[PDB]
């Protein structure tokens, strides 16, 4: 599923990401935009043999099991395919763990490079939230 901007904002809010670990909703929408272009089905292979999955491009070395990744820990206890569903529940649950891991949203290099320090609330402008 390719979410609209406000559509994804509402879903993320509903699932408790607005201000989660102190990161406002705009931060999460901005991260999604640059990670996946709001596409749940996005995948990208990494040099180490892991792959990133879903709207928040969650990686298969630490977080989810894809059966092909060296050194996998599956800390979210989920198949990586669950992160490609139209239902963002699994991605959100796994993103809550990730952002709690010590480095906050810096765990998303696209967030650090493209969202951090910017006017992230622009990403929820116009939405009825």
Swiss-Prot record:
Disulfide bond positions: 6-127, 30-115, 64-80, 76-94
Active site residues per record: 35, 52
Subcellular location: Secreted
Catalysed transformations (reactions): Hydrolysis of (1->4)-beta-linkages between N-acetylmuramic acid and N-acetyl-D-glucosamine residues in a peptidoglycan and between N-acetyl-D-glucosamine residues in chitodextrins
Similarity comment: Belongs to the glycosyl hydrolase 22 family.
Tissues with expression: In the egg white and polymorphonuclear leukocytes.
Main function: Lysozymes have primarily a bacteriolytic function; those in tissues and body fluids are associated with the monocyte-macrophage system and enhance the activity of immunoagents. Has bacteriolytic activity against M.luteus.
Positions annotated to bind substrate: 101
Top-rank EC class of the record's enzyme: hydrolase
Quaternary structure and interacting proteins, as annotated: Monomer.
Gene expressing this chain: LYZ
Alphabetical keyword list: Allergen, Antimicrobial, Bacteriolytic enzyme, Disulfide bond, Glycosidase, Hydrolase, Secreted, Signal
Protein name: Lysozyme C
């Amino acid at each position: 599923k390719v979410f609209g901007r406000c559509e994804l904002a509402a879903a993320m809010k509903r699932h408790g990401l607005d201000n989660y670990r102190g990161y406002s909703l705009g931060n999460w929408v901005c991260a999604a935009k640059f990670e996946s272009n709001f596409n749940t089905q996005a995948t990208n292979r990494n040099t180490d043999g892991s792959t990133d999955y879903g709207i928040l491009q969650i990686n298969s070395r630490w977080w989810c099991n894809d059966g092909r990744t060296p050194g996998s820990r599956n800390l979210c206890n989920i198949p990586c395919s669950a992160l490609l569903s139209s239902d963002i529940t699994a991605s959100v649950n796994c993103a809550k763990k990730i952002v709690s891991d010590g480095n906050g949203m810096n765990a998303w290099v696209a967030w650090r490079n493209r969202c951090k320090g910017t006017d992230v609330q622009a990403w929820i402008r116009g939405c009825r939230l």
